[PDB]
Design a protein around this ligand. Structure first.
Ligand SMILES: Nc1cc(C(=O)O)ccc1NCc1cccnc1
Length: 291
């Protein structure tokens, strides 16, 4: 799977909010482009002159994520974050020249991402009370990954002593995205666990934080809530469910070729962090069938 790389796999079956620190600093921002940020401004002007209803929005930028030594007490992860925007994304990661910016960043800064916006996405492995994961079909008319399968998620918009509020907004944003798109009540959702961070190599390396969320509704009840919103209540064109039993071998199915890179990231991390048992009971051959 060349279109996704794992930046972080979390320990302990995934990390809760209270175990993560963020450092939000202008040191973690994108570097100005070699010939100046005028190239980003030109792409934005051209776009607005065709689609004048478009608007910019701020985004978090991922610089790096450092895990503590395994088994340690105290905070387990440090997220180094900057600020970027939808405009900077369209002028860098989504530019035809994005590969040239990656090479120039390696040359100038020893960092393939130094000249990239790299907005931080969020996604969820969302499990039902009857042990299915939730999948969404993307519209065939959108710009990125048209017609592909996705999981719930989005790209959160800003607003350890500014740090803890930023970690809170990240965890909050994955639940909000599930309520807005799947039409589920907030009180049916568990607090999220962070499983890891995955990179989309088809979008010049931009990263998504991938979370595990449990719902107290069955697959049938989740479907009812999604459909009862009507076509204008969701951006996706359909919902469907796969047994957690069958997610284990999803990369061997015909579904795998239809999954967008960030959803492949969510399923790989779910399989490594929530699946793949370590103990004698769940590891026994009748509960973990070989092959
Ligand atoms: N690739 C992309 C392009 C356009 C466009 O061409 O307007 C919109 C959305 C896109 N993807 C989703 C996204 C990525 C980064 C930040 N926010 C959202």
């Amino acid at each position: 799977d060349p279109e996704v790389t794992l930046l972080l796999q979390c320990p302990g079956g995934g990390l809760p909010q209270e175990q993560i620190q963020a450092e939000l600093s202008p040191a973690h921002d994108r570097r100005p482009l070699p010939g100046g940020d005028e190239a980003i401004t030109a792409i934005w002007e051209t776009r607005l002159k065709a689609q004048p209803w478009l608007f910019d929005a701020p985004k978090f930028r991922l610089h790096s994520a450092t895990l503590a030594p395994i088994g340690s007490r105290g905070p387990q992860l440090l997220l180094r974050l900057g600020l970027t925007s939808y405009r900077d994304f369209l002028g860098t990661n989504w530019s035809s020249s994005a590969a040239w910016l990656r090479q120039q960043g390696a040359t100038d800064w020893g960092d393939t991402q130094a000249y990239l916006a790299d907005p931080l996405g969020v996604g969820a492995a969302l499990a039902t009370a009857d042990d299915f994961l939730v999948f969404l079909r993307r519209s065939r008319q959108v710009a990125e990954a048209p017609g592909l399968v996705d999981v719930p998620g989005g790209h959160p918009e800003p607003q350890d002593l500014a740090g803890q509020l930023v970690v809170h907004e990240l965890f909050s944003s994955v639940l909000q995205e599930i309520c807005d798109e799947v039409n589920l009540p907030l009180l049916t959702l568990s607090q999220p666990l962070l499983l890891g961070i995955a990179r989309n190599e088809t979008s010049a390396g931009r990263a998504s934080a991938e979370f595990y969320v449990q719902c107290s509704l069955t697959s049938e009840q989740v479907r009812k809530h999604y459909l009862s919103g009507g076509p204008e209540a969701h951006e996706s064109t359909g919902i469907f469910f796969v047994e957690t039993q069958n997610v284990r071998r999803l990369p061997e199915t015909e579904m795998w070729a239809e999954l967008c890179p960030s959803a492949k990231g969510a399923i790989i991390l779910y399989n490594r962090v929530q699946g793949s048992p370590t103990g004698a009971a769940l590891g026994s051959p009748a509960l973990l069938p070989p092959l």
